[PDB]
Design a protein around this ligand. Structure first.
Ligand SMILES: CCCCCCCCCCCCCCCCCC(=O)OC[C@H](COP(=O)([O-])OCC(O)COP(=O)([O-])OC[C@@H](COC(=O)CCCCCCCCCCCCCCCCC)OC(=O)CCCCCCCCCCCCCCCCC)OC(=O)CCCCCCCCCCCCCCCCC
Ligand SMILES: CCCCC/C=C/C/C=C/C/C=C\C/C=C\CCCC(=O)O[C@H](COC(=O)CCCCCCCCCCCCCCCCC)COP(=O)(O)O[C@@H]1[C@H](O)[C@H](O)[C@@H](O)[C@H](O)[C@H]1O
Ligand SMILES: CCCCC/C=C/C/C=C/C/C=C\C/C=C\CCCC(=O)O[C@H](COC(=O)CCCCCCCCCCCCCCCCC)COP(=O)(O)O[C@@H]1[C@H](O)[C@H](O)[C@@H](O)[C@H](O)[C@H]1O
Ligand SMILES: CCCCC/C=C/C/C=C/C/C=C\C/C=C\CCCC(=O)O[C@H](COC(=O)CCCCCCCCCCCCCCCCC)COP(=O)(O)O[C@@H]1[C@H](O)[C@H](O)[C@@H](O)[C@H](O)[C@H]1O
Ligand SMILES: CCCCC/C=C/C/C=C\CCCCCCCC(=O)O[C@H](COC(=O)CCCCCCCCCCCCCCC)COP(=O)([O-])OCC[N+](C)(C)C
Ligand SMILES: CCCCCCCCCCCCCCCCCC(=O)OC[C@H](COP(=O)(O)OCCN)OC(=O)CCCCCCCCCCCCCCCCC
Ligand SMILES: CCCCCCCCCCCCCCCCCC(=O)OC[C@H](COP(=O)(O)OCCN)OC(=O)CCCCCCCCCCCCCCCCC
Ligand SMILES: CCCCCCCCCCCCCCCCCC(=O)OC[C@H](COP(=O)(O)OCCN)OC(=O)CCCCCCCCCCCCCCCCC
Ligand SMILES: CCCCCCCCCCCC(=O)OC[C@H](COP(=O)(O)OCC[N+](C)(C)C)OC(=O)CCCCCCCCCCC
Lengths: 184, 88, 86, 128, 469, 49, 89
């Protein structure tokens, strides 16, 4: 229990690293799409672990149920050529890959800090050695969950954003028809 | 690429002896024993020649014999341009 | 805007500090605005607990550097099954 | 360890057990003729990918925007009382905008596969 | 008005035949003009620089945004005229310039995205608007799908713009992770002093700025400009640049930034020098756009930039429209049509244009000298205002680099005029078909603005003093 | 008839249908100076036919 | 925030150093967006603030529309050439 169940988040992180590497290294691009589906299941696992199971279900519904399905549909209908990962083609990238890995990872951990000193900026990243104290109160009498609150703000406080999104979806219809259909 | 592993004779003989416990045929301990024996032709024995026969060659036959297990540009692009790929 | 709204439609975790800082900024001007530095500090503290983590690091460093016993009402961890037992 | 998680673990186990039983008990004798793809008893030549119609692409592509439209109504149905009349008006406007796109799709005949060959209707005329 | 036009157009175009295309565009053209002249009076709202937050603080309306919206309307009117009106009535021109069925809708949706970027007061508004404009622009780049170059350009645009959209999204989310806010309005002088936001805000600035193609990420957009149909290129090289630059000017998130200073210098150098060896007209104009983007990038380093930015962007938009229209008009006089999407490709094809149409070459001369910055043309006053702004704020080395870049880019600007005033052996005697009255009047109005607009300089400053102070 | 020069007086091509040949497609050349035109009406004659 | 950050960085590197096929580029785009959303949702939980989750929902909808348009562009590109090269762009 405890040992496994304490490091569930860390396991999801390790699996995510492995899944990304497998996406990039796959011989068949269909296999790459399947590893992308695996990565999305791992992301849903992480979101459940941090308390957002509704986003787990939404991600499964939309990114696997719709986007990955479209991916597979397209690779099935279309003639794709792909080359395999090899030293002759890809060892030339290793120096730049290593420098970029270190620089981008460190900077992506440092952008979150507010300390003036750069080394302290990086050090704060690994600085959660403490547990959060979860406490109760009794001020919420309604049964309001994340989905309900999202509906509440999206339809009232930010209604304009919803209507603009309607225009964006209109684009997602009109555009594909404009460039995939030949009129007359 | 066919995968080859070399193992110590004791370990592999133990494995083959263990696997003899299942009901379907499986590599024998005695076949592991024979793996250390190379073919020895009797100096005085009749051969294919005495039957007026000429054995075929393994290299020439292998492709035919193994066909079901086979794995599977510049001009092609230009030629592809002339064809139709999407329709009504 | 959804600023100030929690995951349940109430006020988010750090709303109080933010509201007191906004009261400060509303009462002052650009020249006086630095007078509101403590409020903003408190706001950022609530957001990120940086000073709290520093203070805990100090206390834990001194705790692990002590062989003398501790005599104070302690904290006890129990299984979720054992909530209310005995 | 509630019933939910145990059931979800148990299903794949049973699938794998049935697969294992089939592997363990059935014979396995591949050979070249058996390994051929079944196409009515004959063999066909390998071909360049078939040219497909655009409606095949369009159904799958248009699934995604319509699916997102439908799924964006989940926050509304979970918040209908809270947003009551204001949000009802807003959701009506949102639906009408998406219906304009449905209208575009319907009037352009975007998912119709047209039979390319049609009967000839020209008159027969003789130059006397 | 814009949203209404988009809805009505989708319905009407759905019920219309491909032969109605130009007619439909004409309708929308006049509609836009009407909105410009009947709804103009709303400028009064912004007297004494009154600012309005709108839509639950999602949008911001002031005199700056109102002016940018008027400018974008005017640009849309000019560009839609080029699709609604035939230059000539012969078969070749029908083949060269025919509007697609859905192009007008894509233009109007892209304009909506641009105007929403300009008015964005919250980061969620900014991201939705940016993706609206980006997706529209990809579809506009792709809609001429018989062209190999256009389809390849659309793919390149999709991928590079997607990477930059991801950079913008990541910037916004880091800002949220530091401040628990999505609005720049929460930034105060005290907050800027207390926290280091520079890396976050510069990441946002760079994500926005690489989307209009500043150096060192300039070649991909220049390739897209070269490889699109010319009437698409006129639109897609102008509107995004205006929207993104206007948002950054109004946001003022990079004041005295060292990184922006260095990238602006690099952009001026790359734009001036890299235009020198170009032989294709659209590549030359793309490097010109890069240099003028560097000029405007300089204004992101200082406060109180509104007058110089508005002046520069207005005169630059006018000149960009004029030069593309002149190139389009010259197609009738060239010997060799390269293809149906880009009828004219090489600068050398303009050789001897003065003997075929002298006043077209006079228009070209005026526009070229405005780009160079000769007084009293509008370009001179744009550059003068920018120099006043940067020297008031201590950017001395950058002012010298600006002078040097101006001199260098003058060479490739003069290339056009130079070939255009040489001699050609077989010159035009007569032709029965006249170019369209509408488009010639529009081009002439642009030329006259470039030539005589300076007469209104002091009047303009007087009005600016009461609407922006 | 005089050879075209560019903005720096460098040699510049003259273009007409000659540059859409067989041996000048797939030429190694920077996009700024490349003259082969894959949308040219003489290379796109039977496309998707 | 570690898992989102690692996913984003590795997806970006896969996109950049992709020299294999165009589908990998599409996938790397999608997964970079996923990583950004993960970072955002963790911060939303830690602040107990609905703004992060609202932005994440909008990100999901926009990723859907972007996928639809990107694949339409790919199909239109395929229509003229009949194949996608391992440099197909
Ligand atoms: C239930 C548990 C699993 C049951 C599996 C049974 C089995 O192994 O059958 C093998 C059997 C072997 O096939 P085959 O036709 O004989 O091919 C082998 C060659 O022809 C020639 O055969 P070979 O000489 O290469 O031998 C291959 C060998 C494998 O041997 C090795 O490679 C190991 C070599 C290392 C030896 C030393 C190791 C160290 C030992 C330590 C000492 C002890 O397998 C065996 O020897 C037989 C299996 C061992 C069972 C013995 C049990 C004895 C005690 C009872 O499989 C089949 O019959 C094919 C059925 C079709 C399978 C379709 C589905 C496959 C994909 C499933 C994927 C699942 C993914 C799920 C996630
Ligand atoms: C009450 C019954 C429950 C009701 C329904 C369940 C099924 C009941 C039927 C139970 C047994 C009948 C089916 C048994 C049966 O056909 O295998 C016969 C042998 O035959 C026995 O002598 C092999 C011994 C058979 C072992 C019987 C185990 C019975 C319980 C199974 C659990 C044919 O395989 P086989 O010789 O080619 O041997 C093997 C085998 O098929 C594969 O696992 C090997 O990998 C492959 O190399 C192949 O060579
Ligand atoms: C899509 C792909 C998605 C990939 C995502 C992964 C990437 C994550 C992070 C990357 C984000 C994007 C990166 C963008 C490039 C970053 C460059 C950048 O921001 O400009 C710098 C960063 O100033 C740092 O202090 C920041 C210094 C950099 C941090 C140090 C480097 C650590 C690496 C260790 C080796 C901003 O200072 P600035 O120009 O205003 O310069 C000055 C200066 O800051 C002040 O003294 C002045 O007062 C001020 O007025 C100004 O003049
Ligand atoms: C402050 C800056 C803001 C705005 C300043 C810009 C422009 C000035 C303001 C308003 C512009 C409106 C001008 C209307 C008066 C202009 C005007 O004479 O009619 C037209 C052009 O008319 C537009 O093409 C009308 C196009 C209107 C759009 C112009 C916008 C530029 C030119 O006459 P035209 O003799 O050649 O027209 C004749 C005649 O009409 C036909 O019957 C003949 O058959 C034909 O041969 C034709 O030649
Ligand atoms: C009867 C309705 C007709 C109105 C239609 C307007 C369409 C705009 C289309 C294209 C833009 C072209 C330039 C707009 C002129 C700026 C006016 C202004 O003064 O700009 C100021 C702000 O100055 C600035 O920042 C600097 C502007 C830089 C201008 C650079 C070009 C100068 C050359 C122009 C010469 C004028 C030609 C007159 C011909 C006799 C805003 O003025 P405002 O916001 O208070 O609005 C005016 C009241 N209005 C709505 C009724 C018109
Ligand atoms: C670990 C990464 C992911 C982390 C956890 C997984 C997340 C949930 C996964 C959801 C399941 C659907 C997606 C599964 C991913 C698909 C895996 C895959 O890519 O399989 C195809 C691939 C075929 O490639 P191949 O040509 O055979 O490589 C030969 C190299 N010599 O085969 C391979 O590449 C290797 C063989 C894969 C065998 C997969 C067996 C598991 C099948 C799924 C079971 C799901 C759980 C039940 C309590
Ligand atoms: C839950 C039940 C899981 C049972 C799965 C057990 C698989 C055992 C079957 C096997 O031995 O491998 C079969 C596999 C077939 O593939 P292959 O023979 O290489 O090619 C045939 C193409 N006509 O041959 C292979 O290539 C092996 C692929 C999987 C590797 C597993 C190695 C199993 C070794 C047995 C000891
Ligand atoms: C304008 C208002 C001021 C006009 C003052 C003079 C009015 C009368 C001009 C005149 O007499 O005609 C000039 C010239 C001759 O007329 P014409 O005989 O018809 O031309 C032969 C072919 N028809 O007419 C022409 O030939 C027109 C040919 C134009 C040649 C284009 C190259 C000259 C470009 C001038 C550079 C302007 C740059 C502006 C920048 C700032 C300049 C201070
Ligand atoms: C801080 C320093 C600022 C000044 C120095 C850098 C300015 C760059 C000028 C561009 C240039 O040199 O243009 C080149 C011009 C003449 O053009 P061309 O060489 O004959 O060919 C181009 C024309 N064609 C192709 C038609 C033949 O010559 C000059 O005017 C140099 C005078 C500089 C003073 C020393």
């Amino acid at each position: 229990m405890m040992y496994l169940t304490y490091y569930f988040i860390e396991i999801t992180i390790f699996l995510a690293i492995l899944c990304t590497i497998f996406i990039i290294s796959a011989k068949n691009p269909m296999v790459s799409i399947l590893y992308m589906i695996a990565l999305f299941v791992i992301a849903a696992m992480y979101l459940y672990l941090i308390g957002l199971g509704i986003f787990s279900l939404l991600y499964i519904m939309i990114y696997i149920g719709a986007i990955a399905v479209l991916f597979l549909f397209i690779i099935t209908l279309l003639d794709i050529n792909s080359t395999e990962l090899s030293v002759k083609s890809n060892i030339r990238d290793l120096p730049l890959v290593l420098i970029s890995l270190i620089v981008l990872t460190i900077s992506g951990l440092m952008i979150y800090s507010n300390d003036s000193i750069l080394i302290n900026k990086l050090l704060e990243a690994f600085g959660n050695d403490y547990n959060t104290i979860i406490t109760q109160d009794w001020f919420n009498i309604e049964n309001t969950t994340l989905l309900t609150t999202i509906g509440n703000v999206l339809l009232t406080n930010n209604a304009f954003i919803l209507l603009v999104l309607a225009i964006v979806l209109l684009l997602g219809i009109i555009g594909p028809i404009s460039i995939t259909m030949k009129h007359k | 690429e066919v995968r080859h592993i070399e193992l110590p004779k004791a370990l592999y003989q133990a494995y083959t002896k263990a696997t003899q416990a299942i009901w379907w045929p499986t590599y024998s301990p005695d076949q592991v024993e024979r793996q250390f024996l190379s073919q020895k032709i009797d100096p005085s024995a009749k051969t294919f020649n005495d039957l007026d026969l000429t054995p075929m060659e393994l290299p020439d036959l292998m492709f035919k014999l193994i066909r079901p297990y086979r794995v599977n540009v510049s001009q092609l692009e230009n030629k592809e341009k002339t064809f139709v790929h999407i329709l009504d | 805007t959804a600023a100030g709204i929690s995951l349940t439609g109430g006020r988010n975790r750090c709303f109080s500090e933010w509201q007191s800082f906004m009261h400060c900024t509303a009462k002052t001007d650009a020249k006086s605005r630095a007078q509101c530095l403590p409020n903003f500090e408190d706001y950022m503290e609530c957001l990120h607990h940086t000073k709290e983590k520093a203070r805990l690091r100090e206390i834990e460093s001194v705790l692990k550097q002590k062989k003398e016993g501790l005599e104070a009402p302690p904290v006890k961890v129990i299984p979720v099954k054992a909530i209310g037992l005995v | 360890m509630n019933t939910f998680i145990i059931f979800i673990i148990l299903i794949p186990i049973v699938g794998f057990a049935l697969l294992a039983v089939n592997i363990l008990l059935a014979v396995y004798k591949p050979y070249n003729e058996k390994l051929g793809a079944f196409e009515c008893g004959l063999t066909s030549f390998n071909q360049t990918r078939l040219a497909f119609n655009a409606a095949f692409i369009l159904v799958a592509i248009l699934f995604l925007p319509f699916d997102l439209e439908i799924s964006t109504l989940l926050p509304y149905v979970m918040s209908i009382y809270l947003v009551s009349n204001y949000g009802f008006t807003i959701v009506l406007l949102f639906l009408l905008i998406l219906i304009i796109g449905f209208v575009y799709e319907i009037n352009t005949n975007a998912l119709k596969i047209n039979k390319h060959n049609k009967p000839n209707t020209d008159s027969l005329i003789y130059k006397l | 008005m814009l949203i209404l036009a988009i809805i009505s157009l989708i319905t009407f175009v759905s019920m219309s035949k491909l032969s109605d295309n130009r007619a439909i565009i004409r309708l929308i053209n006049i509609y836009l003009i009407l909105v410009l002249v009947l709804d103009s009076f709303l400028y009064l709202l912004f007297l004494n620089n009154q600012t309005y937050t709108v839509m639950g603080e999602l949008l911001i309306f002031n005199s700056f945004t109102f002016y940018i919206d008027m400018l974008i309307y005017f640009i849309m009117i000019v560009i839609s005229s080029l699709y609604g009106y035939n230059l000539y009535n012969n078969n070749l021109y029908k083949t060269l310039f025919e509007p697609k069925k859905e192009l007008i809708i894509l233009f109007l949706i892209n304009i909506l995205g641009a105007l929403l970027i300009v008015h964005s007061n919250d980061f969620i508004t900014l991201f939705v608007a940016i993706e609206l404009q980006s997706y529209s622009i990809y579809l506009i780049t792709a809609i001429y799908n018989s062209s190999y170059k256009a389809s390849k350009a659309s793919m390149l645009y999709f991928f590079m713009g997607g990477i930059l959209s991801i950079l913008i999204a990541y910037s916004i989310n880091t800002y949220y992770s530091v401040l628990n806010s999505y609005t720049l309005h929460s930034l105060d002088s005290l907050i800027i002093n207390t926290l280091d936001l520079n890396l976050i805000l510069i990441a946002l600035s760079l994500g926005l700025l690489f989307k209009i193609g500043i150096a060192p990420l300039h070649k991909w957009l220049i390739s897209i400009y070269e490889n699109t149909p010319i009437l698409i290129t006129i639109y897609i090289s102008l509107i995004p640049k205006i929207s993104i630059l206007s948002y950054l000017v109004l946001s003022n998130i990079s004041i005295n930034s060292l990184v922006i200073s260095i990238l602006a210098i690099l952009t001026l150098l790359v734009g001036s020098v890299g235009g020198l060896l170009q032989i294709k007209i659209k590549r030359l104009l793309a490097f010109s756009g890069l240099t003028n983007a560097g000029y405007m990038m300089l204004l992101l380093l200082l406060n109180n930039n509104e007058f110089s930015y508005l002046y520069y962007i207005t005169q630059y938009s006018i000149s960009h429209l004029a030069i593309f229209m002149i190139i389009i008009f010259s197609i009738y006089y060239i010997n060799y049509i390269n293809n149906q999407y880009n009828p004219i490709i090489y600068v050398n094809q303009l050789k001897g244009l003065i003997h075929d149409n002298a006043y077209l070459v006079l228009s070209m001369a005026i526009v070229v000298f405005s780009f160079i910055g000769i007084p009293p043309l509008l370009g001179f006053f744009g550059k003068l205002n920018i120099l006043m702004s940067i020297l008031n704020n201590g950017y001395y080395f950058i002012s010298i680099v600006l002078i040097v870049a101006s001199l260098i880019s003058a060479l490739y600007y003069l290339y056009l005029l130079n070939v255009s005033i040489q001699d050609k052996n077989n010159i035009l005697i007569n032709s029965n078909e006249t170019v369209s009255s509408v488009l010639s009047y529009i081009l002439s109005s642009l030329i006259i603005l470039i030539t005589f607009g300076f007469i209104y300089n002091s009047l303009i400053i007087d009005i600016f003093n009461v609407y922006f102070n | 008839d005089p050879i075209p020069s560019g903005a720096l007086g460098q040699k510049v091509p003259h273009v007409d249908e000659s540059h859409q040949d067989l041996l000048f497609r797939t030429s190694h050349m920077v996009e700024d100076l490349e003259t082969y035109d894959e949308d040219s009406p003489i290379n796109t004659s039977d496309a998707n036919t | 925030m570690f898992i989102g950050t690692i996913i984003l960085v590795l997806s970006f590197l896969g996109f950049v150093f992709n020299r294999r096929n165009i589908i990998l580029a599409f996938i790397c785009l999608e997964t970079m967006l996923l990583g950004i959303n993960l970072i955002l949702l963790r911060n939303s939980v830690l602040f107990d603030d609905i703004s992060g989750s609202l932005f994440a929902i909008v990100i999901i909808i926009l990723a859907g529309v972007e996928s639809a348009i990107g694949l339409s562009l790919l199909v239109s590109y395929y229509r003229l050439r009949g194949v996608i090269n391992s440099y197909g762009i």
